[PDB]
Amino acid sequence: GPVWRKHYITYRINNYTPDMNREDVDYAIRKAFQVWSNVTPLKFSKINTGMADILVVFARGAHGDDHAFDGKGGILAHAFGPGSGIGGDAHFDEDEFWTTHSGGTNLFLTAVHEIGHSLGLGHSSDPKAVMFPTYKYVDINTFRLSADDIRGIQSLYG
């Protein structure tokens, strides 16, 4: 599968969910990128204008790709693997209620998973792994990447 062939990667937050404080969206997304830069040679920088590698979008229903959202529940988000244009982009379903905590759907935890896809990871069959296909809340303040996820990403980078 495709991988980024460079170490400096940019992201841009296209728009913000009204579910959360602006600064909390920024922080959740920043921390999610950090999870992966911790275990690879990758560096992530937020840009406010122009073409980023990874565009972060909040949208509902049909939103201009082959991955229409399905209302509250079900599919929470999706992302494209490394590549030009839409490649790398991560989309979050606005019909979910995004939060900083255990209520609603945790943005940070969801973003860690989707960014995994943005970097070229597939799914894991291990329920402990963040790349498990289905969402589950774990304490965000003590979150640690599982051994399986580390193995997965280190097969692609570093």
Annotated binding site for Zn(2+): 63, 65, 78, 91, 113, 117, 123
Q: How far is the CB of 132 from Zn ion (least distance, A)?
A: 8
CA distance 148 to 87: 24
Task: Give the Cα-Cα-Cα angle 82, 94, 153 (nearest 5 degrees).
Answer: 30
The listed partner (Ca ion, Zn ion, none) that binds 70, CB under 5 to 8 Å by sort, is Ca ion
Amino acid at 68: A
Q: Which amino acid is at 58?
A: F
Please tell me the distance from the alpha carbon of residue 144 to that of residue 146, in angstroms, as a whole number: 6
Extract the annotated binding site: 19, 53, 63, 65, 70-71, 73, 75, 78, 85, 87, 89, 91, 93-94, 96, 113, 117, 123
Site string for Zn ion, 64-103 (x = CB under 5 A): -x-x-----------------------x------------
Taking residues 83 to 102 in sequence order and writing x for each that binds Ca ion by CB under 5 A, - otherwise, the string is ----xxx---xx--------
Q: Are 100 and 121 in contact (CB under 8 A)?
A: no
